[PDB]
């Protein structure tokens, strides 16, 4: 009765809506059907504009109204695609005020709410029932059940003498869909005073699965429902739409998602004759100076190219940077900005870290009594950057666990009968202080650095930042900080964080330059010169604490390749080699000479 009228109203909305001369949803449905995408995304503002009564009905009882909308969508799709198809999915978009995750309570039960959080865990896809074929044990009566996934269904209790629960499901004739479980935490800035972050259980169906990876901020539209695991119900969220600022599909696939209008914006930006200066100025605009470190951070974000030889040998393509300096250098702020801007990044404190924290941890399931592997910062930050603040504070034991991750880009685990080799292709940006808290020029460099050469060799560029008291620089920095405290170019001299992140993703997924023969010759000459200089610089008393090995040649090659990739240039020429050599001389040889 009323359900038929609701379905008719939804069908009329789909078939009649138009804002100028295009039937938006009709054409969208046809296009989605063309590519075997059985769904439909509806903007709630359009629904409100068309008829407020329909929106009122949808908001009052979402769990009972949405299935009718899906049925209407399926009927319209059949009309539009077949000339006389599973049930279609409804995905909603809204601009309503976001409710803090902690403000969700009894008052919001069985209502459509919008909230944002951080995904911390995802489950393995399960199988749900949509069309069930059943048969009775005694009289063998064939029957069917149609199930919707919205919960306010069971096998009949009485056959259609037969005992209680006489029906048995025939599996080979049934149809199933995909289901996934997600854990959503609240944003750190939104947490109340002195409270632990709160977790929320969420579920997605069909086309909303495999859309988010752990550690990425997302915005969720869903129904705040409850399920009985005696006078209490466990809250959960039924996802209706996922909106994220990171293209997860283009990250875990070689496939790349970028609109034609995007692709052509990133080409025009790359065509800029001085993109390098723009990006250098676009990193930490609130920090004065440190231009070389900003260039190093740009190179680290862009990264190099990785080569897999026919014999199976693999060459690293990630750039690591270490910052050893005096207090007040703004290293931690740079690390925070890098974590904010990179598409994937994890900010960790050395002090508050462990061997099992930063690689992977053997964890026993409470129920199955079986051991599984959870992941740590270097698995959660796979394909991104790991900002290891307070590098010096880290225990030896903890520290030593990082070597293979940095160099071989893998994690080897042999624990509780688990023998596996995980993948961790990450870049490490670390900050640390000298032994005495300042770089005392009176003492030798060896006494100022407690780091063993093995860990230091893995860092492509090492920056020894010393605070020099110069009146002019001090006045300039004071003026800059005062202007910051008391106080938007966007005239081609700087691009916002979002655009920079998108450009970084595009460049990483699009270009992987290569060195020209002239670049190789120049690089070999420079490597020979640098090694000869290091040999000459040696003193009988001590051996060089800062090392120069083949890893430094590989690091310089990576820097050159990243510089070439910056401009989407398929080949790296001597122009980029000169800049890479200058950066290496300014950071690593500068640290070593002292």
């Amino acid at each position: 009765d009323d359900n038929t009228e609701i379905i008719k109203s939804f069908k009329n909305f789909i078939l009649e809506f138009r804002l100028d001369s295009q039937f938006i949803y009709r054409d969208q449905l046809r296009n989605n059907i063309l590519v075997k995408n059985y769904s439909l995304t509806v903007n709630m503002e359009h629904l409100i504009g068309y008829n407020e009564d329909i929106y009122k009905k949808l908001s009052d009882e979402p769990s009972d109204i949405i299935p009718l909308f899906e049925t209407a969508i399926t009927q319209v799709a059949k009309r539009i695609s077949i000339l006389s198809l599973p049930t279609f999915q409804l995905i909603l978009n809204s601009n309503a005020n976001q409710i803090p995750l902690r403000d969700l309570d009894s008052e919001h039960v069985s209502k459509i709410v919008r909230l944002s959080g951080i995904i911390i865990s995802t489950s393995v896809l399960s199988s749900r029932a949509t069309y069930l074929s059943i048969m009775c044990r005694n009289c063998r009566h064939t029957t069917s059940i149609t199930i919707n996934n919205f919960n306010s269904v069971s096998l009949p209790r009485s056959c259609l003498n037969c005992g209680p629960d006489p029906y048995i499901i025939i599996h080979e004739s049934s149809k199933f869909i995909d289901q996934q479980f997600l854990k959503l935490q609240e944003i750190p800035e939104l947490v109340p005073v002195g409270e632990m972050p709160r977790n929320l259980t969420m579920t997605c169906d069909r086309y909303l699965t495999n859309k988010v990876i752990p550690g990425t901020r997302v915005t969720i539209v869903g129904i705040y429902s409850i399920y009985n695991s005696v006078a209490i119900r466990t809250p959960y969220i039924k996802i209706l739409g996922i909106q994220s600022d990171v293209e997860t599909s283009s990250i875990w696939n070689s496939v790349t998602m970028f609109t034609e209008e995007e692709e052509e914006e990133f080409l025009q930006l790359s065509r800029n004759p001085k993109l390098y200066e723009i990006l250098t100025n676009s990193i930490a605009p609130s920090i004065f100076g440190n231009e070389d470190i900003k260039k190093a951070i740009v190179c680290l974000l862009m990264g190099g190219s990785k080569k897999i030889l026919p014999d199976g040998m693999r060459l690293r393509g990630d750039i690591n940077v270490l910052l050893l300096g005096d207090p007040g250098t703004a290293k931690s702020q740079l690390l925070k900005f890098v974590e904010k801007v990179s598409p994937i990044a994890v900010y960790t404190s050395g002090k508050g870290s462990s061997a099992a924290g930063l690689t992977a941890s053997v964890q026993r399931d409470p129920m199955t009594r079986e051991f599984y592997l959870e992941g740590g910062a270097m698995v959660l930050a796979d394909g991104g950057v790991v900002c290891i603040d307070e590098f010096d504070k880290m225990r030896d034991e903890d520290r030593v666990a990082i070597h293979e991750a940095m160099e071989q880009q893998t994690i080897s685990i042999a624990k509780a009968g688990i023998t596996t080799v995980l993948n961790s292709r990450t870049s490490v940006l670390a900050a640390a202080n000298p032994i005495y808290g300042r770089y005392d020029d009176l003492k030798s460099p060896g006494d100022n650095i407690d780091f063993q050469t093995t860990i230091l060799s893995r860092f492509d560029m090492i920056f020894i930042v010393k605070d020099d008291h110069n009146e002019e620089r001090d006045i300039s920095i004071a003026n800059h900080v005062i202007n910051i405290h008391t106080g938007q170019e966007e005239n081609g001299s700087e691009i916002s964080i979002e655009k920079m992140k998108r450009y970084i993703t595009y460049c990483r997924l699009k270009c992987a330059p290569r060195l020209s023969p002239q670049a190789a010759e120049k690089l070999s000459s420079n490597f020979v010169t640098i090694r000869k200089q290091l040999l000459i610089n040696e003193e009988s008393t001590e051996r060089s604490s800062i090392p120069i090995t083949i890893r430094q040649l590989e690091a310089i090659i990576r820097i050159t390749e990243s510089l070439a990739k910056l401009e989407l240039s398929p080949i790296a020429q001597e122009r980029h080699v000169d800049e890479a050599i200058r950066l290496f001389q300014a950071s690593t040889m500068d640290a070593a000479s002292q």
């Binding site: 703004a330 008291h469 009146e471 001090d474 006045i475 004071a478 005062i482 405290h485 008391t486």
Partner: protein, 93 residues
């Protein structure tokens, strides 16, 4: 309920105070000085403004914060050079 802001302030005074503090702190074994302490001067000015439930930092509050920081720095010095440091910094305090 109070969040004071800085809109009118003597930039040159604070810049010169910071530069002088750095120059005097170049000495070995002295109390460390960095941009953190300029930010601390600004923070103490904000706190002094907050003590009056005022919505804007006044010049008097900034002067008081400068005096506090400079007095602490001077007192942290040695006996031999304390007189010279106090004479040099008498302008701000």
């Amino acid at each position: 309920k109070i969040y004071p802001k800085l809109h009118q302030m003597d930039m040159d005074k604070v810049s010169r105070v910071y530069a002088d503090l750095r120059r005097e702190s170049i000495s070995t074994g002295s109390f460390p000085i960095t941009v953190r302490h300029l930010e601390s001067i600004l923070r103490i000015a904000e706190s002094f403004a907050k003590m009056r439930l005022s919505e804007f930092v006044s010049s008097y509050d900034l002067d008081r914060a400068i005096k506090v920081v400079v007095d602490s720095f001077v007192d942290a010095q040695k006996v031999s050079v304390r007189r010279q440091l106090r004479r040099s910094f008498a302008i701000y305090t």
